[model samples]
Target chain A: SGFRKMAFPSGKVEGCMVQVTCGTTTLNGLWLDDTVYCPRHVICTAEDMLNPNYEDLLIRKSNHSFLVQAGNVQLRVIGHSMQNCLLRLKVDTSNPKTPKYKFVRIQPGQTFSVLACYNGSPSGVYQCAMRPNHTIKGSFLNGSAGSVGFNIDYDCVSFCYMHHMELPTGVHAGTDLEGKFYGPFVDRQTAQAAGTDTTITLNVLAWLYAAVINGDRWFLNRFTTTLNDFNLVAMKYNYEPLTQDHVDILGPLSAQTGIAVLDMCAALKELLQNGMNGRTILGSTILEDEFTPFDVVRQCSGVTFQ
Target chain B: SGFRKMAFPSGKVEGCMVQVTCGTTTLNGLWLDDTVYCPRHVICTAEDMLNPNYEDLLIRKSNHSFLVQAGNVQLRVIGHSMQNCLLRLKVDTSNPKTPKYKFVRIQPGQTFSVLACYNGSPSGVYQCAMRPNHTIKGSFLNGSAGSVGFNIDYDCVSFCYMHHMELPTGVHAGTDLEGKFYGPFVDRQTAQAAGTDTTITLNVLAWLYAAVINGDRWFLNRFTTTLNDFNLVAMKYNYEPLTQDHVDILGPLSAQTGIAVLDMCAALKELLQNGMNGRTILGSTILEDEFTPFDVVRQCSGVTFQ
Candidate 1:
């Protein structure tokens, strides 16, 4: 056999790999069962297994246009750059009885909610990208105004809700160093739901994601173990909450601080109350900042609600 | 023959001078008839002869304090400096029937009207000065903040009104190059009163002074001869409308422009209307800025009305 080597573009889980000869010399390579699986089959199998609701399918660097998909939700996300790269996302189709959705325009440093709380209401995933030349504008918002290049990264997960799910008994709640629990609202709805260890865990992960985007170390440090539990869930799901690439890209931004960051933390409390109210937690309507954060967490262990 | 020389401190009009002997040689100087006027007699004669309503009699450079009088009318102007020189002027005595006045503060780049239309109401003169360390603040207001020395200059004239003065026959009104007379207000009140060549002349001069303080050359140039005529009246009275000293001191100020200066001109029209109504014309009430301009003009020739 000719010398072989293998490379994974989106790492092993995505199964997007390349194989080639290494100068006709023997080289280390990943072994696949030739009789059962080919590269294409592996990729297809992996995609079906992951069921990513959002993915960047193609990137056209010539004009900074990207072809992306919000899987199974009937949404179109297109990106093009002239002066500033503009990312436009719209609902591809809507049920006659469903609420009308307007097109969302995402600028640099902003986040759009691809998914709301399940029940088939615009469910998608978390994505982040940077435009080559982005001018930061607005009160208390700051960043470089076009001194960088372009790239993108994102993670997708199930956009499901467990509001009606019964909690398993004796889960109790989580506390910070000060022994203060940041929950237990709406007739202890969170406590009862989180007893099943899924509803409250995902919501807390959402809060942690927003705090990270705001560069709020104090909030993160105060709830270190809670965030650690979120990280463990991401590990179990094999999807990093935030890639190292994301952190490096955000270095130039003077992320939200003081009232700006603190306000987002407060918004989380309100989000929880709304979730417990048997209402659709429309993330885009509740969060005004284009730079707001949204995340999807897997059902896992080690999260608590007061 | 005796050697004698006379040096006037405030020039010949103030009549303050010194006489001394030449060193073993005869010298020529101002010759005052000894029989009628000695030095003290000349000084006292000049004081009463001029009847200056405002004059700086003493300057204490060490403390940056000055003794100034707003002659005839009861007003006290006291100057003292701690950080920046503070010049305070208040009505020395107000008639029981007069409108009560709140204390007015004058910052640099501001003008205070010391004299209103005659009838003995808060009457004084035009005074300008500089504080060594002055800071300019406010929208569209600009000047050096604390980088200079201090000095004072002022001139006073009769604070009388001719609102009821009858127009002399055949003295129509003065016109500029555009043949526009900036007068004929209030059933020809300005026209009739100015026909006697006093009311309109002084008011126009007042307008000119404000324009000058605002550094509005367009307004000043549009009415050059009217301003020249005011200058001639000043020459006739031997008091400059704006001394060379005052002009040099205001070099650092960006002065008022556009609406700020234009508003003052509009205010003059309102002032004329108020004067026609025989109102008190409280200068302090009508004016809000501390850096406003006030000037005194003499009963003189070559002035006009419409």
Candidate 2:
């Protein structure tokens, strides 16, 4: 009998439809036929069947301890008592891409439970191969097992087991944390104002950078020194020496009060960077100023000092 | 008798205010039984006195036409019948390193006019010399001919005939006018919106002289050939090409806008003269692109176009 068309009831005999059941195997001189297995099934209908005597069937099978079932619709295995016995369940599918099973090992005096669920895509059959150690592998089986000229039915219920799929890499937790923000959080007014003001501010910061880092004579020496100090602080914390950092640090405060940190350090940095150095930051007065320690603090403080 | 001080309605008339009454000379003339052949008086005025007149009066024994009045404020003439003869007036205070003088002249046959005006500084004296033919030369003259013996005075007037001051190199009528205008006119809005949408416009006319004439490139074929047909017409009429004739010409309208014409011409000439070299015209773009016919039109139009 092909296992593909086999069906049975779940152990509880509820309305659940069983697709397969495990067969018995004898080893040595021990009678090992008491183990009963059912393929994991889906509850298709809840109607009760007539003459359901599950307890009496168990008493009839007690004498033939290792009897295996085989027939067009049913088969059986009968043998004497045996020790160290193992029963296996396998499922075969016609699709090459569908997952299938190799073999499931059920140890003596142990009842194994298997549950199978269909995947949405690929439409391939998958069997959950579980062992006594709880190790599970979803295998896509190509064919069924056979012995002698007699056909045997395999249990599909023995293949039911839950399998966890692997998660994709760098699958970040939230949607709001990606890409550039261009919204009510950042409109044209803010963008343009920022565009102009940031240029000026960056220029000033560049000059300050120059004053502090290079000591160019075009700007005041004290400004350069202060910038240097600021940069030193920034470097101490590994922060970028720029107004952007400062803005990031202090934007919240500024948004709340419409005013941010206005002190010697900030004023001097801004004056040198934006006012004198123009819009770029780096190199001689022709370009911009360099980074400094105070930049680190200013960035950390969440306020654009220069 | 001495030429006593005399007074007139307009102002005080001092010295021998004698009018020439005919004849050229006289021999053995007498005045009040004095042996002097002809009495002559030259007017003189004291520096401290408010009103003064001629100190000596003498007449030529042989020439009755000549009158001589001698004093600090006096007039003397050696020529015949001085009536209606053209008188020239001259004043000089060219040296900026010294005191300046302001003097007025009245011609004998022409209307008297204010020739020069200067407010004096320091005690340095000046002489206003006049001659016939309306020719004048002013210099320091303590004593010379009948103009003798006088201390330096800050204010004084001298008169002579027009036959003296004629010069061969004086300006002739109908020459082309050459001039230039400079400015610091700032439009408030443009100045406020510099580098923005608003732009400031400056228009001016500049003139060139001989040296700039032969050297100017706007008149050269290389530069003018690239100008529009209309500009070419103007160039043919108003502009002179660089030639041995040593003439100056007006630059192309495109070359003249904003930039100094001479500078543009020189730049163009430099590129041509150096064997078709490339240069930066405004910023980083090459001069080749800048001097193109299209770019020339665009620049001259004062509108930003491709």
Candidate 3:
């Protein structure tokens, strides 16, 4: 029922028509060109983002998922019964920028991947929904005749435009950027100082997806390496590392500590900076001997370790 | 001999007299009205700061350890052998502002507390040295007759001028501010957004000292509590808590993973933020059930926990 022309330079990229399946195709499918399909009621709550329900927040959808102006949209088919719904829809994947829509058939136990970007801001609808228990990495469905009508779930994730400080080669983030994923920054100071984008509206889902799809390893490997280094440095210099007091002070590294990646990194950076400054020990700058390792840990976590 | 009028308003606070023990009393005891005794050769390396030895960079010393304008200079009497050296020096503690020189005697096994601050900046010398094994909290001496000439180790620490967001009541940080220590911010975003100081020059030792003297607990306590909350929430909502995969992705919470506090916090924050957004699990937004705990955790680490 909703259809309109997009605002874009015709020379920049061609526009694609997007159609979403509601109850019946008897009525024209939801034409989303100037708007987006936001199934918030089935996915997120009102407290999470702007419109936690139907199509009140409509952002411009784009294929340039990597660009700050655009974003990525992921649609998930409910189950095998809904697989036929794929045949009813149209997509534009012919051109890199934009192309005309074409219909596609669905296969049993086949993988479903809908890759696109959207502008999820201002109105506050940067997130969408997927069925519970669906593998975020991807999902599979066996085409068995189940229900009469079908339903589709979706999600809208943000992107981070990073600079090539250490030659972030092959690091493509955000709705399928044309590059590889390599930038591993966690804080604003180091990220901004190195020209990395920090103001991007990022939440848990986008970052988690970034880690899985884009291979962001700093999430775990980076922290373990840094924590180990702190202990090694302390031991190398005859200082007690990760003592009960330290644990009490810095939190348990091996526990289910809910410390945010940002806070942990900053706290560790503060400690390592102290080590480089000879402050790891209570009153002594005893961590001065193993300057190399400490410095390495700091560099990896300080700027880019991934 | 170095002596000069301090560049300060006479009424703000009375300027105090400072002197150093440079060999003999023959050359006026190296009057330190205009210079500070760095002792870089014995305390720190030239690679650490400007003028690593003797007195090349002279930062004005102050007793108002709290004021950004004035600074504190701490002097350590070598050992029990040099206890008498305390008698040779004169201090002005009678008036809070500018009291004249007054001599004092040393007592055996007594405690020594030199509370002061100094501006260790610009020329790149913000750190000084202390005895290797001396308790950072304070030190003690037997005052048994020993060596003739004594040496004094020193240190110059920077300060954080924090705002009273949560009524940082009684929080006196940096040198010797009249207030008590209370603010517990860990990063710039959280610190700055709340009017807390983030640019105050800080390092490991200063932060360590801050933790000890001012009771900065985010270094350990904050991380631990936040991490525990993450696990609790995950378990509360029937998700696998701290799985091997999780450890691989996020690092071991109970092991010496060498993760920096900053990185760890960021990683955890990213995860928790994911939990809030239903991204903590690989493909499902299953962490939505326990929203209260998740929200509480996000608030604690996101802005202020301590």
Candidate 4:
């Protein structure tokens, strides 16, 4: 029994309750203000929050289901579970101010929706996730579940199909072979300055997840795009980009001849600006008209096509 | 003049000439292997790369003026100076095969563009920046500017305009005065896997730049947004968001309140599932839900909102 109130017949104390560890509900599903104060032992553990096991943690109570609906920019979840075990709904919206909490816990779910469909946070993105953590308390009749633990199997995941770049949007990050590799090796970053480079590492990891792990283009390019941007800046200054696939080309011809990107550009610029005009057997000028970039390339990557 | 070489009659370094500082060239302008190694100085500093003081640091070179032209993605600068000081262009690029020295010595300018006009890095985004660390070996005309000073006035600004999610994009922020205070007073976090309050700080700085500094909307709600988000989470757990504008709010009102956001979500889930529904209005619920989160909030801040 959790906590039960005792009514004394003319004694010093009137109402008080304390933890009665070992007992049965047959003791009068006891009444307190017209309702029974039954004790149930549900617990929360760190494992729920620390790991990424979405499936193993889904707590399916017998009479459990949700009546949920969403509009373009709002969402509402009315709990209809037979057991008033706990009603947990993280009510999200474009924006709000009324509820001090960003979530909902209507023991008996209420008519929940955006405070005002009109006055919203700007983005009409809404998501609802419902997975109960039922591995505790009542099952204690057998032992382990009746512990005072909290926040362990605590993974609260609600990846809304919203239209924002915070997580994934716009692209159907699933639907296809590549998309399937989307959430498995996922990572997160806080909103801040001075980084994004971390995303670089995550991107690379994703690349490995796809090509090296998934055997397909599971979008390894997320990191590659940033890397490409970063790599190109080197070229922007006319220097060479970093090697992305030099390892697969190891040989005498593969000596690490690293050069500045700008140097390459400068050489190209020089050739483009002043291509050698006609030559003689003595390397002398023949007919002197100006040539185009085509001429420079023809003399070099080397060719002379029409 | 940049660098010039001579066809030594015969020597260990035949036809190889290095920095002959003081010079006057008037040869076939050069007919060595077949070229003229002239010089010109065009530089862009790290300061230029790091900040957007575009209008401030334009060094009028005694005669610091560049005849620059950029058409869409390409840019070109033809040199017309009287000094072949040192053409310092950071010649970096996409990927390179070898490193032929770090920087480059570009005598003149080249036709440069930001886009491929055609096949490029694959997106519709292109930015141009030149990394320059000009060289002047020993132009000891008097000798002073050529001292070993690394970050002389390299004060990077933009920090003022680094990329992120805080800057206003689609909306004018407040359709709400201050559009209700965007980026007012923000906070920061480490480069860890969680937190966005840090962005609140950056966005506020941006607010100052625009309105406080630039005379634009200048509405910064740096605190408001986080406050708003902070406020809402409390509502989720049947609580209230703290009063951000209350002054007695105290020292840094002012000091930061942190949370391992993931854990916060877990506690909420545990609560929503077990809040007092048809239970005894029995002064117990108060001693619990309201009591627990308060202990949490106070444990974090000191008080539970105003």
Candidate 5:
């Protein structure tokens, strides 16, 4: 028989096609060198991708100190080329329990600039992470999708102190200095005086004690002479022990416990001398006089002219 | 004694008495009237003021006629009113040169309603005049100001004709036969042939013309035939215009005026068969079929079938 001829479709095919046979053809070893190849799936690895540029991430400093002055401090992102990306800023410090940070979202062709008063410590390390909310498709022509990272140096006071002081008791106690400092001392003295068995005029002592311990020139000048006069009056009229009102009026005795009478008198004198004004104290000059000495002690001391 | 009592500044009145003589006068009679009167400087005359009620005004139709089918006609006031406002709408029948009568502007709170549409006459007289605009003060609370004049009513169209054959030369020429006749005409020839060269076309021959027109039926049948054939050809030719190729086959005269032929044929057929489907000779159905028939004629007129 004559050789049989095979018929196939008439059009020309442009690209190459490979043939495979049924027998055990080592498919892996088939180096079909005649076929054309392009770098279609080359894996490009970026090694230092995780390391963000710290300088770009950090906020700039004004006075070379970490304490950011109380004003509008601008924090901006630099060299970012992604669309719809978020930059998260985290403050890393010795205190890990509390995180002081802020994050901003930026769009493509957009610059993020925020005017804020940063009160974090200057020494704290501020780290930033960029997250792409949307995937950028590769351009129809020639382009590859890639990401960028950067950091900044942030120096400002953290809001931890303000947060702590936001407590109601802290707020109230901060304003009452004497009550804050001498509260325990007054309790201790009250216990001691209670056990003494002696008829201790603690009220009188409380007034004097509060005056000395708290360095209250007004209280010392007003009650010092009253104490001495009380003793005199007691000796003359067989005085009784002090009442609760007397104690209440005397305030806390621990306030005056550490101070000497002479020193208190001196402080009181200086205070009074410095405190005196033309309208409040009796001076040799007329009320209209421009210059007048503050007689702090004499003004409070009971020396009245008829 | 008087001379003795009076002492002169000079040495003359030492101890002497001086007497002064006085004369007494008699009173005279006098008459005075309390009521004051003044002559009238400007003699003011008040005329009969007509306050036409809106109800009455609306009931009484003025002689003016408005062309209802014409475009919008607006009357706007541009002047103030004077006292004794009067507006009279009179029919100007005497001469086209002079207005037969005019309407007077009625007083405050008055209105006049004129008939806008009149089928009786084609031409009529209409004019609006007003009195002074007034601001009355003192007698009323403070003052009130308002206009008391008539506004000029610009007429849109006044003539009524059986058919308007005077179309801008190239656009269209036809009759609004329905408007003139009360009903659609059966055929154009019925009217045209019957009234060949007579004034029957001009006479108010509404009923007679409609009964006599016979060519309308032939015109309508021919119009419908042209429309159907054109539509078929148009569909076969994919709605393309009949070029010289189509003209060589359908003949030159048919090709040149094919669109008009198809349009008029469809319209005429629809009118004769359906009695125009309404009061109008160019009924709604005819208008609806015009564009399609027109397109078909345009496509099949000039091109050869093969």
Candidate 6:
């Protein structure tokens, strides 16, 4: 009386409850007695259900020793024998045009867990790394990292960066909004204490994503907006674009609005190449710096641009 | 004294500070022009610097429209017409192995910055997404995701899932950690509420990663340690690997003690498979449920018929 099971017209609809009728006109002819019956089942058992991997389970070790485990919403990494790695956070945008990722540090010992409570970033057991080398499978394929996937595949908009990244672990409980390292950084104090140069790459994939999903053309921003936004970025943040084309072609991408993300990325790249020098959209000015988001951008991206 | 700049020999020492020939130098070298000429000409101007991308700077939008402003560390999506969309965060692991990513949701309006604060997750201005679909770049190449570069690359490490997914703007303060969305349930109330059937997959990459970096085999527990610690993890408080023979294959990665991270991932995958069945390292049969962990070792990994 306390069990649940699937029911079939005749098979083992046994464990479950069922209703029956014998083409009844009166007295509700006993369907069971009349030979018409139902059954319940779902091949339910630890051995049958769990299907332990004990069988033919051949475990192999690659040229890596990174291990990731989801605690709450955060993914815990075991630095293993490694230490002081940049520990990259990767995400699949699901968009061919844009990108996705973040950066943080992982000290020695897999004792740390990069928190996953972005206010406006990707999600999943995204990837983490020690440095920027080695292709993520190929010269261009997204590498060994974790990423997010939609509850249901959508049709309207598109994500940037990661596209193939998926999480089998269910949606985690939200984050503390803030981090809790309990390490040299106890929280942010530890993160900030170990603060290094942040390299930034101004790529327009985000813009492309926006454009692909929203009102086209007329609503985009101008390349200058990219310049302005760059100006708005902090000195702690160093940035640049992919190449001259990134800057040269983006303004052309500008719609009726200020500018498109593509153009902005290009404009940003231009300034980066020229040493953080640039003009804002309305005519503001850009300044130069030795470092800022540049390193973060540089270190995190697995790709080297032209 | 306002700013610090690197000085090479004839020009800031050419490499690190080599000469301390200032105040203590008994013998005065040469008195060029009797005025010791060496002007500090760096054109320290906020303008004409950071070369502006103002190419006639006629900002144009692409066929599509969308604008994103960098307000602090937040990637402010110009909600031109877009209302709701998921914000994807990606990181380039730079490893020629697998892939990774993270995700968060974004609403309309510019007031909200896609907060780049992830706890045990990935971060950076990374990428912002509107929906889901499409692959990142197709060719075999490193993707466009922002990751972090360590003070220096190391021969160690291999962090667990979701690398440094922290926001540069700083651990964006904290979040509802418990989830403020308040679905049919509060906090994860909804997550626990709409508990959907879990989809599980068994992946050996992370462990392989561990093995590649450490004493391969015997280290399973450290990664599992990753799991135990993950159990310690939560949104600040949330909830949350394998083998033998694996021992002979991996070693240099051995921790002398701690549980290996590979076995951790494997054990984890196992739990997820049984829908949350398994045991603690101490050995307590794991229970099954909506989503604890699943079994991937089965159905797909193939099996060894005993």
TM-score (chain B) for candidate 6 is 0.19
* Between candidates 2 and 4, the lDDT winner: 2
lDDT of 1 at B13: 14
- Angstrom error at residue B134, model 5: 59
Task: Give the Cα error of residue A186 in candidate 1, in Å.
Answer: 49
Q: What lDDT is reached at residue A273 by model 5?
A: 39
DockQ for the candidates, in order:
0.01, 0.00, 0.01, 0.01, 0.00, 0.01
Clashing pairs in 1: A110-A290, A110-A291, A111-A290, B53-B71, B110-B291, B110-B292, B111-B290, B111-B291, B111-B292
Fnat per model, in the order shown: 0.00, 0.00, 0.00, 0.00, 0.00, 0.00
Better of 5 and 6 by DockQ: 6
Interface Cα RMSD, each model: 46.1, 59.9, 29.9, 43.4, 67.5, 30.3
Top model number, TM-score: 6
lDDT of 4 by residue, A4-105 (tens): 000001000001111112112111011112111111211113333234232333244211222122223223322221122211222233222121111222
Instruction: Put down candidate 1 lDDT per residue, B151-181, tens digits, no spaces.
Output: 1122211111111111233112111112122
The digit string of per-residue lDDT tens for model 1 on A110-200 reads 3211111111111111122211122211101011010111111322211111111112321112211111221341212232333212222
The count of backbone overlaps in candidate 3 is: 79
**Which segments of candidate 2 are over 4 A away from where they belong?**
A1-177, A183-203, A221-306, B1-306
Best first by TM-score, ranked: 6, 4, 3, 2, 1, 5
Q: Which 10 consecutive positions of candidate 4 chain B have the poorest summed lDDT? A: B1-10
DockQ of 3: 0.01
Tens digit of per-residue lDDT, candidate 5, span A41-106: 111123211332323422331112111111233222122211111111111222211122222222
Question: What lDDT does candidate 6 reach at residue B14?
Answer: 10
TM-score per candidate, in order? 0.13, 0.14, 0.16, 0.17, 0.11, 0.19
lDDT tens readout by residue for model 3, A1-306: 000000111111112212232222111111223322222111222242342222331122222211111223433322211111111122332224332322232211111222111122110001111111111111111110000111112111112111111212211111111122222322111322122221111122122222222232233333433545555554443233443333343222212234443343333333444433222221122211111211122111222222
